[PDB]
Design an enzyme around this catalytic site. Structure first.
Site, PDB file in Angstrom:
ATOM      1  N   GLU A 105     -19.993  -6.738   8.882  1.00 53.70           N
ATOM      2  CA  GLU A 105     -21.094  -6.056   9.555  1.00 53.70           C
ATOM      3  C   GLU A 105     -22.084  -7.050  10.149  1.00 53.70           C
ATOM      4  O   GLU A 105     -22.572  -6.860  11.270  1.00 53.70           O
ATOM      5  CB  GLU A 105     -21.811  -5.119   8.577  1.00 53.70           C
ATOM      6  CG  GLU A 105     -21.062  -3.823   8.280  1.00 53.70           C
ATOM      7  CD  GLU A 105     -20.034  -3.981   7.174  1.00 53.70           C
ATOM      8  OE1 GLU A 105     -19.952  -5.080   6.585  1.00 53.70           O
ATOM      9  OE2 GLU A 105     -19.310  -3.003   6.890  1.00 53.70           O
ATOM     10  N   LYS A 143       0.835  -1.193   0.000  1.00 59.53           N
ATOM     11  CA  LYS A 143       0.000   0.000   0.000  1.00 59.53           C
ATOM     12  C   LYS A 143       0.874   1.248   0.000  1.00 59.53           C
ATOM     13  O   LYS A 143       1.790   1.380   0.817  1.00 59.53           O
ATOM     14  CB  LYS A 143      -0.924  -0.006   1.217  1.00 59.53           C
ATOM     15  CG  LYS A 143      -2.117   0.926   1.092  1.00 59.53           C
ATOM     16  CD  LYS A 143      -3.270   0.485   1.984  1.00 59.53           C
ATOM     17  CE  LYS A 143      -4.542   1.251   1.653  1.00 59.53           C
ATOM     18  NZ  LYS A 143      -5.696   0.815   2.484  1.00 59.53           N
ATOM     19  N   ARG A 147     -26.332  -3.746   5.562  1.00 58.46           N
ATOM     20  CA  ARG A 147     -25.840  -5.099   5.324  1.00 58.46           C
ATOM     21  C   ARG A 147     -26.014  -6.011   6.533  1.00 58.46           C
ATOM     22  O   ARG A 147     -25.912  -7.235   6.388  1.00 58.46           O
ATOM     23  CB  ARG A 147     -24.362  -5.057   4.922  1.00 58.46           C
ATOM     24  CG  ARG A 147     -23.826  -6.377   4.385  1.00 58.46           C
ATOM     25  CD  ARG A 147     -22.397  -6.242   3.869  1.00 58.46           C
ATOM     26  NE  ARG A 147     -22.336  -5.598   2.561  1.00 58.46           N
ATOM     27  CZ  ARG A 147     -21.289  -5.653   1.748  1.00 58.46           C
ATOM     28  NH1 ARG A 147     -20.193  -6.318   2.075  1.00 58.46           N
ATOM     29  NH2 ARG A 147     -21.344  -5.025   0.576  1.00 58.46           N
TER      30      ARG A 147
HETATM   31  C1  HTL Z   1     -13.297   3.668   1.269  1.00 55.34           C
HETATM   32  C2  HTL Z   1     -14.194   2.457   1.632  1.00 55.34           C
HETATM   33  O1  HTL Z   1     -15.343   2.447   1.365  1.00 55.34           O
HETATM   34  C3  HTL Z   1     -13.494   1.298   2.353  1.00 55.34           C
HETATM   35  S1  HTL Z   1     -11.972   0.722   1.874  1.00 55.34           S
HETATM   36  C4  HTL Z   1     -11.806  -0.469   3.063  1.00 55.34           C
HETATM   37  C5  HTL Z   1     -10.611  -1.387   3.207  1.00 55.34           C
HETATM   38  C6  HTL Z   1     -10.656  -2.580   2.261  1.00 55.34           C
HETATM   39  O2  HTL Z   1      -9.384  -3.146   2.297  1.00 55.34           O
HETATM   40  P1  HTL Z   1      -8.821  -3.885   0.944  1.00 55.34           P
HETATM   41  O3  HTL Z   1      -7.698  -4.818   1.329  1.00 55.34           O
HETATM   42  O4  HTL Z   1      -9.942  -4.669   0.312  1.00 55.34           O
HETATM   43  O5  HTL Z   1      -8.288  -2.755  -0.129  1.00 55.34           O
HETATM   44  P2  HTL Z   1      -6.852  -1.957  -0.002  1.00 55.34           P
HETATM   45  O6  HTL Z   1      -7.121  -0.521   0.364  1.00 55.34           O
HETATM   46  O7  HTL Z   1      -6.146  -2.023  -1.337  1.00 55.34           O
HETATM   47  O8  HTL Z   1      -5.997  -2.598   1.064  1.00 55.34           O
HETATM   48  C7  HTL Z   1     -12.989  -0.393   3.844  1.00 55.34           C
HETATM   49  C8  HTL Z   1     -13.264  -1.330   5.074  1.00 55.34           C
HETATM   50  N1  HTL Z   1     -13.879   0.566   3.428  1.00 55.34           N
HETATM   51  C9  HTL Z   1     -15.180   0.800   4.145  1.00 55.34           C
HETATM   52  C10 HTL Z   1     -16.249  -0.340   3.983  1.00 55.34           C
HETATM   53  C11 HTL Z   1     -16.787  -0.949   5.106  1.00 55.34           C
HETATM   54  N2  HTL Z   1     -17.703  -1.903   4.938  1.00 55.34           N
HETATM   55  C12 HTL Z   1     -18.113  -2.276   3.733  1.00 55.34           C
HETATM   56  C13 HTL Z   1     -19.179  -3.391   3.589  1.00 55.34           C
HETATM   57  N3  HTL Z   1     -17.627  -1.708   2.648  1.00 55.34           N
HETATM   58  C14 HTL Z   1     -16.708  -0.748   2.733  1.00 55.34           C
HETATM   59  N4  HTL Z   1     -16.193  -0.144   1.521  1.00 55.34           N
END
Ligand code: HTL
Ligand code: HTL
Ligand code: HTL
Ligand code: CA
Ligand code: CA
Ligand code: CA
Ligand code: CA
Ligand code: CA
Ligand code: CA
Ligand code: CA
Ligand code: MG
Ligand code: MG
Ligand code: MG
Ligand code: NA
Ligand code: NA
Lengths: 567, 267, 566
Positions: free
Chosen positions: C317, C243, C345
């Site tokens: 969730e 990242k 959700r």
């Molecule tokens: C901004 C947003 O909505 C993000 S980005 C992110 C991290 C995901 O990590 P991943 O490993 O999949 O991607 P990475 O950044 O490349 O490490 C979250 C929890 N959220 C909030 C979130 C919370 N809960 C749900 C169901 N969807 C989202 N998008």
């Protein structure tokens, strides 16, 4: 056994095991005789009352072993779904109450905290056991208590995403709990899915995996459970049972013996849907049918046999079912998601975010809308009008009988966008069904009776009861058909020419279709008296569907009293 | 229903000993549905190998089996209109193992052809000639005292041609013993656009024909039973059959225009 | 790089790869240089407009390799969440539009089908990519199309149950599709859960597993993707990225550089986090739960002071709520911190596991209302409507910082399910009482006594309503509670005023205004009623002030509506 006993069987040992404490005083050499006596009583009593059948037979030995080894109710036992928990209730101070099972004011269909200290978690929807057990384990540790936590989950319930989320978190916190997989290679239908093929992943996720063991060998069950009871950290026991064990007719037909009616009209709305799905699929090669493990309930049986390449059982995965439909619609296919109102609660986010926000062409056939009867409040379809009509883009329909269901299914299907058609369990007034596949105009009600002072605006299957009331009062009756878009023109006309508008729906009054009419009247400054009839703001206790409707005032007698009391 | 064209010869034990109508007629009725499945499999395979017309033949797999099962071909005269849907017919008339030569130099022709097989009663390609041809054979056979059946299979598209109308009217006049089978799938190459398509049996009865149907063209039990009854009836008979172009291959059922014909598969 | 360029960088190769087809004309030798140009153009544009940052830097190489090897847009690419899709947008004919990103009428925060043919699925919520790609693949196979289907999902998004459901079903239908795991060992915070531990170590659920491979080795990526493009059946590729790759401050502080800003008063989330710590210091029963949103909901201090009572459940969730239900069964006092848009959700767990059992669980619902640039996928538009129809729910709508603290306390102490909704950002900056005492349930507060028209405000539009009331001399009520409703107050005002006006930052359909209307109808009270709130459409992204103005929820819009009704 080959026949269900009609007279109470002689169970001298079971009678001495009315609670787990009593059970634990018996000797191990007695448990296999107790298992036989429990199976006989179970057959007898479910024959008397009707109810879930095969799954409980499969866990007779497991239930005995669990209460024999663990210090219940101090140790926490969580049954997943709970349809297999009749032996559990028989051994927890409720054997002589099983005659009231699933009857008004009698024992509930599933474990229920308010019913007994031996029920740690009210269940009905699947796959909650691991999450609940982990919460109790975490709390008990923080409180300095030394109690055990156990979750019994079937292979079908384990296909849900929330069970995966729970297994993952338990490893993270290194909780002292035992998950028992009750694997009989079955759901309601056969368990279809990538996880059933597999049935280690559990080991790689942080769990100590033991098994598989014979779930019907009481000696091995007691010894194994004894060993893992005092083991620390997340423990996972793989048990193998046979659905219907010990009753040959059920072993030979596990689908038909999933549930039985107590021993001794028109088509079911689900059957009308099933016929519509086949007829529309015969005419449109793009139609795809999706169910989350409810082929029998929603009645996709014929469709699955005739169009196997366009039928999809995603297991108990409501979330995936909806987003999967969204992806299909992106490629121009026409998915129909068959889902119970109560279970669509679990895919709300996918409906909003993946379908509605994108205005994708997905049809939702919402069965078990309204009160569902003996299964009780955990399965009531009380809210789908409220939680769907607030979502922009949703076309929300409420058919009043069989012909209307066929028409509105066609209307929702031909509509290019998200559509929902809701209908109850059971059968209807048995009106003639037009064999054609033709839609109706969107957003227009149908006047079924022209009267004088009261206008009954009916959303759904209370129409026949409202017609009886309207014949007694000489009232106007409208078959509204659509909650969204509302027939505003017709509502406006009736508000000017009548002294009282009455809305009727088999949905929560709060947020419901009647409130859609109220919102319209307010926005236009129309101040006609409005009487909203529907489901009250509490959880209606299990009974026959007619008894629950009568309690809610949604039969002719209750409707008329409400109207005349207002007037 | 399949999604992929087989790249290798499927196992077709029943089809392989139904190499000719006489052999097909010795199989029991309970085996015809399984034969339909094998024939469809082989059709998908061989057309994938050679190119050829596609969707129309898939739609008459069951009709072709029932026709050669109920009628005494080649003594009974069967006429296919256009002929682009006659690959199943060729597969069941001593040419299955020659389909690998289809539409290649010195191989099987694209359409039925008298010089190619005694089972092809009329060379076709241009449309709407089958009723005229079958009527000519029926008149001739009656005059020479030979008791034989005459059957024309014509599509809803081919039936829009003026000459099919002329033939329907003359056949009624002479009261010929012949069967016209309307293969109706609501398609030409494009969608069938025209007044006749909109109408699709009063028109045919007013013209002097004994109309039956519409029946399901993929219900073999119904096809065999219906055809057996009409075989025992005389005079101008008109059977309305309903089929699905590309039946049994989902991509073709979803894109009938694009799967009217396909090119040879390449690896 | 160590500084964000403040001037449009020179990117000659990038300007020749304005689309995937143009990119696919370049030679493999050029690709490593293209990754540097894209990377520094990305740094320049996000600095000009603000937005998501570190995740997109980690997929620069993966994004180039994907469009170079696959025949996009005919081949279907699905990005999970989409916050990492800025490189994707840059390479799909939107590079010169990135200057409008996340601005009114500009590019959306996430991929959007209506925005570009190269966006197969509108995302924002996580974990939908595998399900959507599977549905696409099932459709393409029935249609006889040869197109590929690819889903790129991060290790965080993979923690959601819905991804597990999709992976299992894809195996069952033997789908020809490729799932690319973008594993950077991070979510927003560090990833948690047993799945993350397994991924640090090293598929049996029916997937052909390949990897791990270096997600920043373009030669390896191109060759691996080429091999897997043509493989049949469920294919699973494990890619490892860092990242913030290429920007040293982000590589060091990947949490802080998850999103950046371009070029007084505490945030409501910060008021919640302080209440959480203060109540936990007085009550050992309090447990705080978040689904991977420690920073957004602001459980930072609580997680540090009370590590034993803080639970990050990953992006789960559903499990968060049922977990809290189980905790409540043992007499503990769980608080579920969850955005309104993500609570939808867990709707079934809230209803079936909490409400039906009347369990003592507090829901701290952040991002209630319009959330601004993240747009409609994240709007908290419906939580009043979908919660107030559930029996047993206590539903509260604080109007400022002090009210948030008090209503959190009220719902926490209430013996049953309670919900407290509040918006992103800061408030009117009113004094906060440090005490921790509840207020009477079901009672509103009259903030201003006037005449003719009464404004019944549920939530943070109170300040705007007070301005309107200055010119019209209106009565103003801070309702506090949607459920149970202060029926006695509503009854009094209905008899003494000529117009009642309800105001809420929630859908008008089914919302708090409709609860008032239901009550007036049940008692036969005929006073005119004007319902102000969010309209029945998805509000396009913009500054929060711009979205509220569009919806008529500022003082100007409220005054206009009231005067016209009068
Ligand atoms: C901004 C947003 O909505 C993000 S980005 C992110 C991290 C995901 O990590 P991943 O490993 O999949 O991607 P990475 O950044 O490349 O490490 C979250 C929890 N959220 C909030 C979130 C919370 N809960 C749900 C169901 N969807 C989202 N998008
Ligand atoms: C009747 C009911 O609620 C049951 S029982 C059952 C499958 C049971 O399979 P399992 O393997 O877990 O147990 P087994 O019977 O012993 O084999 C389903 C899908 N349902 C309906 C259903 C659907 N979807 C959800 C989320 N929950 C439930 N309870
Ligand atoms: C390829 C070719 O020569 C075909 S197939 C066909 C229509 C087929 O429709 P039909 O309903 O009769 O059969 P179906 O395919 O089973 O639906 C046409 C117009 N053509 C071209 C054509 C044009 N005009 C004439 C006189 N003859 C022909 N054969
Ligand atoms: Ca549609
Ligand atoms: Ca009913
Ligand atoms: Ca009258
Ligand atoms: Ca930041
Ligand atoms: Ca205050
Ligand atoms: Ca104070
Ligand atoms: Ca403000
Ligand atoms: Mg099972
Ligand atoms: Mg045709
Ligand atoms: Mg990550
Ligand atoms: Na049964
Ligand atoms: Na073609």
């Amino acid at each position: 056994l080959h026949e269900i006993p009609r007279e109470r069987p002689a169970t001298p040992l079971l009678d001495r095991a009315s609670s787990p404490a009593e059970l634990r005083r018996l000797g191990e050499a007695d448990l296999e005789t107790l298992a036989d006596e429990l199976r006989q009583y179970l057959l007898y009593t479910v024959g008397q009352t009707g109810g879930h059948f095969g799954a409980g037979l499969g866990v007779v030995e497991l239930t005995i072993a669990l209460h024999y080894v663990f210090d219940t109710p101090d140790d926490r036992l969580v049954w997943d779904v709970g349809h297999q928990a009749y032996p559990h209730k028989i051994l927890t101070e409720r054997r002589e109450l099983m005659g009231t099972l699933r009857q008004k004011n009698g024992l509930a269909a599933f474990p229920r905290r308010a019913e007994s200290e031996y029920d740690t978690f009210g269940v009905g929807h699947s796959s909650t056991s691991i999450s609940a057990a982990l919460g109790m384990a975490i709390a008990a540790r923080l409180q300095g208590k030394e109690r055990k936590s156990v979750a019994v989950i079937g292979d079908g319930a384990l296909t849900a995403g929330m069970a995966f989320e729970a297994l993952n978190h338990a490893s993270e916190v290194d909780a002292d709990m035992l998950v028992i997989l009750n694997d009989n290679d079955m759901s309601i239908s056969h368990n279809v899915g990538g996880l059933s093929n597999y049935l280690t992943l559990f080991e790689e996720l942080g769990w100590n995996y033991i098994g598989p063991i014979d779930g019907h060998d009481l000696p091995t069950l007691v010894a194994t459970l004894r060993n893992m009871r005092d083991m620390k950290g997340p423990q996972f026991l793989h048990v193998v049972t046979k659905k219907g064990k010990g009753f040959a007719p059920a072993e030979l037909d596990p689908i038909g013996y999933h549930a039985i009616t107590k021993l001794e009209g028109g088509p079911k709305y689900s059957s009308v849907f099933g016929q519509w799905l086949c007829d529309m699929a015969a005419q449109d090669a793009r139609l795809l049918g999706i169910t989350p493990a409810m082929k029998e309930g929603s009645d996709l049986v014929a469709f699955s046999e005739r169009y196997p390449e366009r039928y999809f059982d995603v297991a108990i995965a409501e979330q995936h079912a909806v987003t999967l439909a969204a992806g299909m619609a992106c490629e121009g296919m026409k998915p129909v998601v068959a889902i119970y109102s109560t279970f669509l609660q679990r895919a709300y986010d996918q409906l909003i975010h993946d379908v509605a926000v994108q205005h994708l062409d997905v049809l939702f056939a919402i069965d078990r809308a309204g009160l569902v009867g003996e299964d009780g409040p955990t399965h009531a379809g009380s809210f789908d009008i409220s939680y769907l009509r607030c979502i922009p883009g949703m076309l929300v329909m409420t058919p009043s009988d069989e012909d209307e269901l066929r028409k509105l299914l066609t209307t929702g299907y031909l509509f290019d966008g998200p559509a929902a058609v809701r209908y109850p369990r059971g059968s209807g007034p048995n009106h003639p069904i037009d064999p054609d596949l033709q839609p109706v105009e969107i957003g227009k009600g149908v006047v079924r009776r022209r009267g004088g002072r009261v206008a009954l605006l009916v959303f759904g299957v209370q129409l026949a009861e409202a017609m009886k009331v309207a014949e007694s009062l000489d009232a106007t009756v409208v078959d509204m058909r659509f909650v969204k878009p509302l027939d505003e023109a017709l509502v406006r006309e009736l508000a000017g020419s009548h002294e009282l508008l009455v809305t009727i729906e088999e949905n929560a009054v709060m947020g419901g279709a009647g409130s859609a009419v109220g919102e319209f009247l307010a926005s236009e400054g129309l101040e006609v008296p409005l009487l909203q009839l529907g489901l009250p703001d509490y959880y209606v206790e299990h009974a026959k569907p007619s008894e629950m409707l009568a309690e809610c005032g949604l039969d002719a007698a209750g409707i008329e009293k409400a109207v005349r009391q207002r007037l | 229903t399949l999604h992929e064209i087989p790249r290798e010869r499927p196992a077709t034990p029943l089809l392989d000993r139904a190499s000719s109508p006489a052999e097909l007629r010795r199989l029991g009725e309970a085996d015809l549905e399984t034969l339909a499945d094998e024939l469809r499999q082989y059709l998908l395979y061989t057309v994938g190998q050679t190119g050829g017309h596609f969707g129309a033949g898939l739609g008459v797999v069951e009709l072709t089996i029932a026709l050669h099962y109920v009628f005494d071909t080649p003594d009974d005269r069967l006429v296919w209109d256009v002929g682009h849907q006659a690959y199943p017919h060729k597969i069941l008339t001593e040419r299955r193992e020659l389909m690998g030569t289809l539409r290649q130099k010195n191989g099987l022709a694209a359409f039925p052809r008298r010089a190619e097989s005694e089972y092809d009663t009329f060379g076709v390609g241009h449309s709407s000639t089958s009723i005229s041809a079958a009527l000519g054979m029926a008149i001739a056979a009656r005059l020479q005292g030979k008791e034989r059946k005459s059957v024309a299979v014509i599509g809803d598209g081919a039936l829009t041609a003026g000459m099919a109308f002329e033939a329907l009217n003359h056949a009624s006049e002479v009261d010929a013993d012949m069967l016209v089978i309307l293969n109706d799938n609501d398609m030409s190459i494009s969608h069938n656009v025209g007044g006749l398509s909109n109408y699709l049996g009063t028109l045919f009865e007013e013209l002097g024909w004994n109309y039956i149907g519409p029946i399901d063209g993929h219900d073999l039990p119904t096809l065999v039973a219906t055809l057996r009854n009409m075989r025992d009836m005389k005079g101008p008979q008109f059977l309305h059959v309903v089929t699905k172009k590309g039946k049994g291959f989902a991509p073709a059922e979803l894109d009938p225009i694009g799967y009217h014909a396909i090119t040879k598969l390449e690896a």
